[PDB]
Amino acid sequence: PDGVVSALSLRERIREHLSSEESVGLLFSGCTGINDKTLGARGGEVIMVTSGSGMGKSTFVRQQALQWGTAMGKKVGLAMLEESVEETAEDLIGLHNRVRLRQSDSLKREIIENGKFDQWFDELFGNDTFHLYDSFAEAETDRLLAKLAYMRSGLGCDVIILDHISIVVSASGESDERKMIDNLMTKLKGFAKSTGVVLVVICHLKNPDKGKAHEEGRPVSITDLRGSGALRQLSDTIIALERNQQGDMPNLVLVRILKCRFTGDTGIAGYMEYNKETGWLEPSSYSG
Amino acid sequence: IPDGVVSALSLRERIREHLSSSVGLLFSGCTGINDKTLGARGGEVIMVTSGSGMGKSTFVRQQALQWGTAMGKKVGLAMLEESVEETAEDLIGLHNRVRLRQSDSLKREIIENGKFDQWFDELFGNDTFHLYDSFAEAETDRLLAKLAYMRSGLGCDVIILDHISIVVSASGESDERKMIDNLMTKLKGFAKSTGVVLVVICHLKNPDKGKAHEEGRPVSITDLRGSGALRQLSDTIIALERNQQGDMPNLVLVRILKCRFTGDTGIAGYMEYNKETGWLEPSSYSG
Amino acid sequence: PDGVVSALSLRERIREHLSSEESVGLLFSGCTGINDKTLGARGGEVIMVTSGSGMGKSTFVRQQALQWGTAMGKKVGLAMLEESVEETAEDLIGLHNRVRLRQSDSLKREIIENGKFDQWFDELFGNDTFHLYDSFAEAETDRLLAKLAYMRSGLGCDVIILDHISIVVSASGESDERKMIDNLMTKLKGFAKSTGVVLVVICHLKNPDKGKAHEEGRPVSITDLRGSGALRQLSDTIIALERNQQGDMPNLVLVRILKCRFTGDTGIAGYMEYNKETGWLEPSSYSG
Amino acid sequence: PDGVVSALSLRERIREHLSSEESVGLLFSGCTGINDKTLGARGGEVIMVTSGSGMGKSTFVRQQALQWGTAMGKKVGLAMLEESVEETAEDLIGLHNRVRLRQSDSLKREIIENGKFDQWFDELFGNDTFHLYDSFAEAETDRLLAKLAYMRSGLGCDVIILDHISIVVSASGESDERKMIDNLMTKLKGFAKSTGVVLVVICHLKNPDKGKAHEEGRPVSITDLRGSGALRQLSDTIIALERNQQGDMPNLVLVRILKCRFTGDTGIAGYMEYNKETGWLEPSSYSG
Amino acid sequence: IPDGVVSALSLRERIREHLSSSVGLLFSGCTGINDKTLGARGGEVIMVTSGSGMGKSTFVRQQALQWGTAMGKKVGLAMLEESVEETAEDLIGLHNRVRLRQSDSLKREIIENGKFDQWFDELFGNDTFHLYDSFAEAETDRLLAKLAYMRSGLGCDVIILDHISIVVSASGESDERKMIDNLMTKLKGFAKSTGVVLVVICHLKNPDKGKAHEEGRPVSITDLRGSGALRQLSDTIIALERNQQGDMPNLVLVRILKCRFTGDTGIAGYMEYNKETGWLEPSSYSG
Amino acid sequence: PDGVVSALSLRERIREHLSSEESVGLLFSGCTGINDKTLGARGGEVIMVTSGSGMGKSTFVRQQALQWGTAMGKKVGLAMLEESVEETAEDLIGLHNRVRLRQSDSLKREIIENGKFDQWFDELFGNDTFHLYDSFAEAETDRLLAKLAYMRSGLGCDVIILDHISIVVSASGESDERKMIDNLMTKLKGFAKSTGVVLVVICHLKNPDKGKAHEEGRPVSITDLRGSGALRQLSDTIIALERNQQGDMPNLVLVRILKCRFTGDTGIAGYMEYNKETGWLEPSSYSG
Numbered sequence A, C, D, F: 001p002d003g004v005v006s007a008l009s010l011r012e013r014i015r016e017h018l019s020s021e022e023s024v025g026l027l028f029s030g031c032t033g034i035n036d037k038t039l040g041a042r043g044g045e046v047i048m049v050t051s052g053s054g055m056g057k058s059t060f061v062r063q064q065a066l067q068w069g070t071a072m073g074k075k076v077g078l079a080m081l082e083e084s085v086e087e088t089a090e091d092l093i094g095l096h097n098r099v100r101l102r103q104s105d106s107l108k109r110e111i112i113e114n115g116k117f118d119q120w121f122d123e124l125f126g127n128d129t130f131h132l133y134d135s136f137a138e139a140e141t142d143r144l145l146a147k148l149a150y151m152r153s154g155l156g157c158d159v160i161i162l163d164h165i166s167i168v169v170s171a172s173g174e175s176d177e178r179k180m181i182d183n184l185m186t187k188l189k190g191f192a193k194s195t196g197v198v199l200v201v202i203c204h205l206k207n208p209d210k211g212k213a214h215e216e217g218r219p220v221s222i223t224d225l226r227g228s229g230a231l232r233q234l235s236d237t238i239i240a241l242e243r244n245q246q247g248d249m250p251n252l253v254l255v256r257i258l259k260c261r262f263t264g265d266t267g268i269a270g271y272m273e274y275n276k277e278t279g280w281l282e283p284s285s286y287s288g
Numbered sequence B, E: 001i002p003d004g005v006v007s008a009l010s011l012r013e014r015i016r017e018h019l020s021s022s023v024g025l026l027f028s029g030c031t032g033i034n035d036k037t038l039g040a041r042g043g044e045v046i047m048v049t050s051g052s053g054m055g056k057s058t059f060v061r062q063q064a065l066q067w068g069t070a071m072g073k074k075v076g077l078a079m080l081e082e083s084v085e086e087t088a089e090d091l092i093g094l095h096n097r098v099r100l101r102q103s104d105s106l107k108r109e110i111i112e113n114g115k116f117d118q119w120f121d122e123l124f125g126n127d128t129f130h131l132y133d134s135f136a137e138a139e140t141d142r143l144l145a146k147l148a149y150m151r152s153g154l155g156c157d158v159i160i161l162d163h164i165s166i167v168v169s170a171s172g173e174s175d176e177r178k179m180i181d182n183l184m185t186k187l188k189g190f191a192k193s194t195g196v197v198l199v200v201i202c203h204l205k206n207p208d209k210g211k212a213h214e215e216g217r218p219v220s221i222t223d224l225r226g227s228g229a230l231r232q233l234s235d236t237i238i239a240l241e242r243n244q245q246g247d248m249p250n251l252v253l254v255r256i257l258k259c260r261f262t263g264d265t266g267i268a269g270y271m272e273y274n275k276e277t278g279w280l281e282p283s284s285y286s287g
């Protein structure tokens, strides 16, 4: 039974490896430092981003999809399960154009009439780099995976953003969905590793209800992550955002690398500030 | 061969339609709900929920009363779990700052001293309130038509459907988890077309994994009963929390779990229930 | 399709409602406060009574039976599945004459030979307000209900006490009796709501075995109720009895309203003390 | 479906009940007070006795079997699973005769030669009141129950002492023996209730390993009991002994009534002192 | 018809036999074990156990060495998990206060400077030690005969059977839980008849329900591996406990779980393992 | 039946034993102390290495491979089931030349074009001491073992590293893979003990999710080891790596000997620090 290769006979294979074997790919936008401790997002890697409900996850991720899909011309696949395509389409446009397009009826009215809409649409979806999952109607694990599968190998997406991994909708008849979040994870990491696609997954936090928490600051710990630490093991990197909406600097958010397989370099990456005007998470200078 | 994954480039018209079609009907009981939501829009679907017996119906009723009184709007009430007379009693009582139900003396009183009629007209005078009537299990389409009649027939501005778990429809298809989802689409659809403000109530899953709801514990979008089809079709989501086994049982924390329009979520503010007047008064608090 | 009424057109129906519509009914004996928070027990309602093991449940419930069956003269149907009718019959007599008949061989021998037994027997059971299920030989759900329903409809009972709802004894061949308790609740609630009878039910608590517990004080919580929270919903009022048997005042008991649908007024009702001499649950003046 | 009896029609049944319905039976020996709070051991009752390993359980119980089987001529059934018949036979003899017969080769030698053995044997096993389970070899639940069953209904024992309910030995192939201790319990209480036999069961304590414990004093709490509180609910009374072998008065032991269904009277019963000479647990006067 | 329940009256003779047939062989390493047990009696069956790798074999070996040296007794050693040479090494080393095994230098030393032979005779001179030999799975009866030969053939006073889980016998009967029980009866029986002191070692069940053994945690009679047939047939039961992840890893608590003879149980006392000499020295301690 | 030897008659066998009997062997690199407590790794022994997720297991183990394969020139068989041979090949090269080759696209491109790649490749893999299992395509137990055995017996490896023992992939159709891990252990231990090879195996930890954990410091305990304590017995030495990635010194790691059969010397071995520049686990001077 021989499948036992001696290191000597791997010379070429290894050489072929070192050349065009990327260790730095897809850098995050909005806070160098995330990049310092992670060296970006490698293909085949599963990237986890979390935070207190409504503190940065969504915006942050949505911004990465934007930069990757624009300035760096990558094919971005979007799977925003809790919202409609036009809705997320709307967010991107406003965001790209640094305007709270949704939070303003006046503006939506304007651009549609003065014609700026069409301008903005082509200026963003012009190079056909964005592709989304359409439905809203509960997607099943394999059902979903099949579609992400299509996005990767079919439309050739470089990145897939799955927003919210609690919306499972699968094989109902097996206690505690904990097993679900885990099996799903396994299928995601497996899907990622083999296709080589960068996979950014969002998940929520357990409600600590034992101290003072999240919405009020309080660092998020690897244990806090929803779903029984199956993702704490299946995901290669873990970005967490922390901020105190009920404090002094509600828009000051701290980025913490809870985990990073590739580099092993963990800890506080840096900070960012939410600009209510532009609706962006701008880079910041701070230290507490 | 493909299957349901659209490209952004092909969303042009769809996005355009979406973009076209600011502040209407501000809730009562706690400013801030408005701060974070700017009130309720026609066509929009409001979702109010909380633990069992924490004030879901109460909150919704207070809204009905202010909207159908102060802001002269035609309200449609569909409380599938209580007699019309019952809901009427609550409205009549609330309107007069008294817990008519918790008082057999007061009820007797107002009926004998003649005040009932006074109160009854002083409230139901302008003909702004209308209700569904039964307690005898209502079917989806059955109910919807009726809600549709209230909007088109009687011309209501708001429609309150208390409790969206009382489905009662096409039985034979497993896990009513889809019922809740299908109905919600029919509800969201109906709301959007007619442009009526729709406030709906749904229960929460029993976490039974920690210390829960009736004992504080913030509610999260995941907790919502019914397989999150509603955390979707519904535009705004309010959540009422309180710790009845605590020091301030009447103190309730309002939490905006979702506001499609303003996207502004989090804690709206605090309110206290007035055991006397039975009103949800805005409170002064911070934890 | 028209079944939509207008508030105005309901004037008479509402008028009819506001009078002879009972909101207050059958006050609990033992502590004013249970009444302040619950306004008593309404027909068609399901009262759930619980506590630690051997802490007072049955006695609390049996007191409500004696006072309702006597002073407020109502037909009480008793279904004490863990005790013989003559035994429950025995407690009622003792209680009615303020003596712990059972804890005394001398008093029993007495009342039997001095002829006081017949006196008390008449002076109590006379008005034929008491009726009981009979067996000890495991009863089935429908079997039981049928009997209950007979008490309500056949004999015309205003109140039905069902001591202990974990003694199911039914359609064995379906995993975890967790579903049994839940399906039983639904039937009880339904039964109660439709017939209009006052339904007082007792149930056990989950053994916390994760801290210090119940018999040693420790407030019970809705989560503690045995049976997967089917009853924490179907039942209208939940009365929890607490006390610390290994403390300075073992007989001192805290009454907690875990839930009151009607009033929504929850929390600590007040305290009671057990009179080891009369066996009565007397109200108490106390504060911790 | 009528099995619904009205209290009025139970007059005779009830009368027949009150007379020759014992509430005080089999009082404990060695510490009045246990009797004050429990009124003894009623037939059909399941009595639980526990303590730190080697602190009183065995001796205490062994003494009750002795008094009940002697001075009060009751038929005592013994099931000492961790020891041989001759061995427990030996203990009783020595104990009855207030001498550490086992802890003394000199004495065993004497009585056998000087003939006092035969004297002591007849003076104790004379009235044929003692019957034991024989084996040592792991007994199975139903296997055991069958034999206890025999002791009760066959030899007509008034009391059965089952020493140690952790030695289960039954239906191996079902996770966590926790279910075992519980099912067994259920079968014991069921066996007890129906035959009317007094059942004294011994069980050990969970090792707290979170504080300072048992062998060093520390009151035993109902939660501490081995086996998932199935016995905390199935047993009618619970006697616990506490003492500090590593303290000042190692032989001073406190008796605590952790539970008592019949009376509801819980708390510290009283104390006793171990006399290394007589090997008995003598009554004491103390207060800490 | 009856079944195995005897009455006290019929135990007369049996009790008599039992009553007929004080201090022999006192353990080494911690007085108190003796205080609570008065040593080991012939015919008696001693049971030593503890967590995995906490010093079961070590303790037993120290006993073998003191008994076969200081108290000139013939010891039979049956360490089914180690070569004769290995156990011999331990004895030789212990006898000279050195951890021969943890030293490749010392081993080399004593062999070259000639000390090995000196030590070897100085110890195995009086011909008091004898061992089983293999590592090749031994069968119950197979092993017993051999133990029987050591007692009758070579005339040993003590017999050490290290590890009673290495059964290796009549395979085909489920749960080796009975094997352990049957063997134990054969062992207890053999001990009682011949009157040889038998020290046996058995493992513990892995509690995996709390914080366990290697981390402190007193061991209880229930923990004993093998369905408590041994907590029965064995007359005395010693238990060694220590917290290797603590401050005093070498500090071990000896606990008498059972002493049929004295009935005196509980904590015997404390000992410390001498990383240098490799001896279990009595310690001064109290918690 | 005679197979009973006398100590005396063994003199020569013992003499032969005491010399050329190796007790010290293959010292671990990274921290003296692992060696003080374990005396290195003996052939025929099973070394178990573990820690939190992405905390250093693989790296620790891979260092032992490089030093044993080089400096102490032994045949090392690598079975990294979660990484490509060229990838493990890549880490060994980088490590050997004290550079984090993988975390640098610039260094890779360099060594490839300046010809240093071939130099390093030879200067390392030259002596043919390194050999690896090859796939990523799930390996079966026997399948794997067979391969392992080939490395030991066929190629003559002194050490066999098997990274990760939760990747089972075998006879699916039998509940909880808890039995799989245990049966696998037995085979490994057996394999090791019989062939005499040094077997270093890695395994995961159970997610404590009951306090603050592992990645955040928190000493691991034998109970934490994943896989039902089959390995906590079959394996000879258990090395646990601890560190707090969200602290002041993330790269500082505490080495804990969870168990050492040979020496019985357990506890904290000492500390190590990860050199982010050379990627080497260097010893550290520290004390908490």
Ligand SMILES: Nc1ncnc2c1ncn2[C@@H]1O[C@H](COP(=O)(O)OP(=O)(O)NP(=O)(O)O)[C@@H](O)[C@H]1O
Pocket: A260, A261, A262, A263, A264, A265, F052, F053, F054, F055, F056, F057, F058, F059, F060, F243, F250, F251, F252, F253, F273, F274, F279
């Ligand atoms: N003590 C340390 N401090 C900081 N980085 C480290 C440390 N030890 C290793 N690393 C680096 O962290 C990364 C992951 O380490 P590695 O040992 O490969 O992970 P692992 O624990 O095997 N992963 P997993 O299989 O996911 O648990 C590598 O780049 C290592 O070089």
Ligand SMILES: Nc1ncnc2c1ncn2[C@@H]1O[C@H](COP(=O)(O)OP(=O)(O)NP(=O)(O)O)[C@@H](O)[C@H]1O
Pocket: B051, B052, B053, B054, B055, B056, B057, B058, B059, B081, B242, B249, B250, B251, B252, B272, B273, B278, C261, C262, C263, C264, C265
């Ligand atoms: N925040 C509050 N504090 C105290 N009492 C309240 C509060 N809100 C409502 N109540 C009262 O509690 C009772 C039940 O409230 P209601 O909103 O009718 O229940 P619900 O949640 O609709 N019930 P259910 O359908 O059983 O969940 C009524 O008497 C209310 O007036």
Ligand SMILES: Nc1ncnc2c1ncn2[C@@H]1O[C@H](COP(=O)(O)OP(=O)(O)NP(=O)(O)O)[C@@H](O)[C@H]1O
Pocket: C052, C053, C054, C055, C056, C057, C058, C059, C060, C243, C250, C251, C252, C253, C273, C274, C279, D260, D261, D262, D263, D264, D265
């Ligand atoms: N607060 C109290 N303090 C002291 N004794 C009490 C108290 N309440 C009841 N008792 C007595 O305690 C005994 C047991 O009470 P009872 O309510 O019958 O038990 P229970 O809780 O129904 N038992 P179980 O079904 O085993 O939980 C009776 O003799 C009661 O009279």
Ligand SMILES: Nc1ncnc2c1ncn2[C@@H]1O[C@H](COP(=O)(O)OP(=O)(O)NP(=O)(O)O)[C@@H](O)[C@H]1O
Pocket: E051, E052, E053, E054, E055, E056, E057, E058, E059, E081, E242, E249, E250, E251, E252, E272, E273, E278, F261, F262, F263, F264, F265
């Ligand atoms: N109390 C102790 N403290 C520290 N080391 C000890 C102690 N007792 C024994 N040791 C040493 O620990 C190692 C293993 O002891 P040993 O008694 O041989 O293991 P064991 O328990 O028989 N092993 P196993 O069969 O695997 O359970 C030897 O080097 C002993 O000298």
Ligand SMILES: [Mg+2]
Pocket: B056, B057, B081, B162, B163
């Ligand atoms: Mg309601």
Ligand SMILES: [Mg+2]
Pocket: C057, C058, C082, C163
């Ligand atoms: Mg009861």
Ligand SMILES: [Mg+2]
Pocket: E056, E057, E081, E162, E163
């Ligand atoms: Mg050993």
Ligand SMILES: [Mg+2]
Pocket: F057, F058, F082, F163
């Ligand atoms: Mg690894």
